[PDB]
Symmetry: C3
Subunit: 147 residues, 3 copies
């Protein structure tokens, strides 16, 4: 059961609040606490100072995430991962996850260590400023340029 | 033609007849349009999860777009590469935009099927694939990990 | 003062006296403040598009911020480098934060004018530019691609 706000201009429901507390904008069947449907620019968050959007969790073992889906199937995500915060800025590292065609996790393409800033490619625990598990290709030669 | 909820005789939320909802604006330009100072929107999860950007079809591409004065500057999006099977297609791209908001191309492309990370490379064929130069402050070779 | 829309017997949406909107909380701390379990917010586009983070001036930085227990952990933002022409300025940065939420600096900086990808490097001068060490599991050299 749901509550809806409509306009006699189109008779179409514009906002819906169901009995479990979910709010739909453009849907009468929201599947999230806030569920918005649109065309192109769905949501716009404007800050008149430095800032913007915050994704937060209620506990250190709950991991905030931004998830990209197509037809509501996981494709990519950027998230703070589950590495334990044991002190000294350990844990809660940044990860870009890739998902298969059915939405199952394939792996972490990128993991940035919070304590060191080390950038890992296919490496969940990078041990150098850049750390690659696998192959490396450069179009202009075989060497780094000494910067 | 729209409805506004007011507190302190000021409109706080507005719903128009086209279905757009504004928080802090009486003239929303998107389905949800929020204005604030600093932390504009906060999404708090009591489990692992958060915010989902979704599309209604495989050929519609979900994106997070960063603008300044409503001009495109950067974006992180799932691109239009066709999903031909075996996890092909729908790769991740970080796009840069010029001062007028026109695309300058993908600075980074990550392949979904392999995880390969391409810098200035649309079709990475190595775990890291760079088109151009590579600078390292400490020497010219990799350390064998 | 605040108004809440109540269903069953529970407040679901709240508008307080300063104009902040809470969904799942009667004490919103930002313009829009949403509480949920797992799937907190879902933004669905029936075309190519999605979510826009925008600022009202070039010196204001739009940001996506990841927190745990409301303490900064990571952020991805467009920085305040001056837009002096030729697509200079407004570069992309990924910032890391310590356990108390204080900034530890930019782990990654992508230059908008060139696309150059800097790791621990504020001004990348190569297509990839690393300040520090480099580790590769398969050898000490790049493969010529």
């Amino acid at each position: 059961d749901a509550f809806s706000l409509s306009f006699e201009t189109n008779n179409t429901p514009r906002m819906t609040i169901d009995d479990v507390g979910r709010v739909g904008v453009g849907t009468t069947a929201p599947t999230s606490a806030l569920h918005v449907i649109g065309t192109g620019e769905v949501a716009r968050f404007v800050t008149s100072a430095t800032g913007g959007v915050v994704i937060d969790s209620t506990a250190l073992n709950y991991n905030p995430s931004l998830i990209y889906r197509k037809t509501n199937i996981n494709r990519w995500s950027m998230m703070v991962n589950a590495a334990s915060e044991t002190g000294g800025n350990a844990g809660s590292n940044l990860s870009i996850l890739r998902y298969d065609d059915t939405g199952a996790t394939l792996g972490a393409a990128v993991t940035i260590d919070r304590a060191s800033g080390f950038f890992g490619i296919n490496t969940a625990a990078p041990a150098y400023n850049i750390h690659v598990t696998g192959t490396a290709g450069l179009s202009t030669g075989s060497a780094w340029t000494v910067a």
